[PDB]
Design a protein around this ligand. Structure first.
Ligand SMILES: OC[C@H]1O[C@@H](O[C@H]2[C@H](O)[C@@H](O)[C@H](O)O[C@@H]2CO)[C@H](O)[C@@H](O)[C@@H]1O
Length: 213
């Protein structure tokens, strides 16, 4: 199937970070203000007044080589629901922009709201906070516009150290692609991705595996 991508980073607790959202071993980890994992899955989101749980900095993208990357996304997939996509992994092959032909395997860690579409909101620090700014309360805020975030690579240098690597990836591996389209299929999650969220679905074994170069 084909879909559409956007980019974001709002610092909020991800929607698959609550129990009973899907058939998983444990929900996606959330983190405290200094990015340390928290073990109470019921902690209040940092995007709500008085909340303490934020997005973890290790749930950011990285390049394995020039044609293949790994990362995370907030998703809305036509024909399915949050119990079907939370913690599932998908292989994307970009079909437009400067990254056309490149592949990226992502794990869904949150939910978007685009009915009838296959929307993947890629986790990218500096990609834009959108409606909720959890980053201001967390550490003082991130630069950039609300929708779309920063403009140039040099802006990543003023970010907190734990979010710099994901910020640079947008300009380096991703070539600053602006909402590229893609074709995708559901795949078994790589161990590398499950290591950062802690969340593996019970039906993961019913899908094909991908070979990380
Ligand atoms: O609402 C989805 C997502 O949008 C992100 O901004 C988009 C914006 O909606 C689109 O008009 C513009 O062309 O591209 C940007 C970047 O993809 C926003 O950054 C996210 O917080 C939000 O979740």
């Amino acid at each position: 199937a084909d879909g559409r991508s956007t980019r974001y980073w709002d610092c909020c607790k991800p929607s698959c970070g609550w129990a009973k959202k899907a058939p998983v071993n444990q929900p996606v980890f959330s983190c405290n203000a200094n990015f340390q994992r928290i073990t109470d899955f019921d902690a209040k989101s940092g995007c709500e007044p008085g909340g303490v749980a934020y997005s973890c900095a290790d749930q950011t993208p990285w390049a394995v080589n020039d044609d293949f990357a790994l990362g995370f996304a907030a998703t809305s997939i036509a024909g399915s629901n949050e119990a079907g996509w939370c913690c599932a992994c998908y292989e994307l092959t970009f079909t437009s922009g400067p990254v056309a032909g490149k592949k990226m395997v992502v794990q869904s860690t949150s939910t978007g709201g685009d009915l009838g579409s296959n929307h993947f909101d890629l986790n990218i620090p500096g990609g834009g906070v959108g409606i909720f700014d959890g980053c201001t309360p967390q550490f003082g805020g991130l630069p950039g516009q609300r929708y779309g975030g920063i403009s140039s690579r040099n802006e990543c240098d003023r970010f907190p150290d734990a979010l710099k690597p994901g910020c640079y990836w947008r300009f380096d591996w991703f070539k600053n692609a602006d909402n590229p389209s893609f074709s995708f299929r559901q795949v078994q999650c790589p161990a590398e991705l499950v290591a950062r969220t802690g969340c593996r679905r019970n039906d993961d074994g019913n899908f094909p595996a991908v070979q990380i170069p």
